[PDB]
């Protein structure tokens, strides 16, 4: 099979420039048996990649801003690989990161 990889940053011994690099990689199966005869891999910018904190299942989705207390998560859907992008709604009560009941 191939080799999944990890998001990155444009730096090894420098300041991480724009972009976070998620890689795809594979090992060139040789040629009457096979063996490791090469390795080919690319890396794309995993930095303009919309992410979801309030998704049922997504990128490590944690709705840790509006659980129950008149809670709703009306999130910020697609901008890119950015946090604090899950807006919450205070469901039928007061609003003073505060979602509150009615009197």
């Amino acid at each position: 099979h191939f080799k999944w990889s990890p998001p990155y940053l444009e730096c090894e011994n420098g300041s991480y420039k724009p972009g976070w690099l998620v890689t795809l990689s594979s090992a060139i199966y040789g040629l009457l048996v096979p063996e490791f005869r090469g390795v080919m891999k690319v890396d794309i910018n995993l930095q303009k990649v919309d992410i979801d904190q309030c998704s049922s299942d997504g990128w490590f989705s944690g709705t840790h801003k509006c659980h129950l207390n008149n809670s709703e998560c009306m999130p910020i859907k697609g901008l890119g690989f950015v946090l604090g992008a899950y807006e919450c709604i205070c469901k039928a009560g007061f609003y003073h990161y505060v979602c509150l009941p009615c009197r």
Partner: protein, 79 residues
């Protein structure tokens, strides 16, 4: 877990939580990031944008191409 897991990368929490130029425009990194756990459980393109599928498609095309081509008999190593 996730909360305690936020104290992971210093001079990057701007790039992590703010996703900001504080950790980017001026912050000495000297090292690339690594989502080997900073992602979800593993999303493995099971929680996928289509672009994952597009990438894997071109991947697999080139992969089969070179494999069958190298699987051609009498591999010459004629580079």
């Amino acid at each position: 877990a996730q909360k305690l897991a936020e104290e992971v990368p210093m001079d990057v929490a701007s790039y992590l939580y703010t996703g900001d130029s504080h950790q980017l425009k001026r912050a000495n990194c000297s090292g690339r990031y690594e989502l080997a756990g900073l992602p979800g459980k593993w999303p493995a393109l099971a929680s996928a944008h289509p672009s994952l599928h597009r990438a894997l498609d071109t991947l697999t095309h080139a992969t089969n191409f070179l494999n069958v081509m190298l699987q051609s008999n009498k591999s010459r190593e004629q580079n």
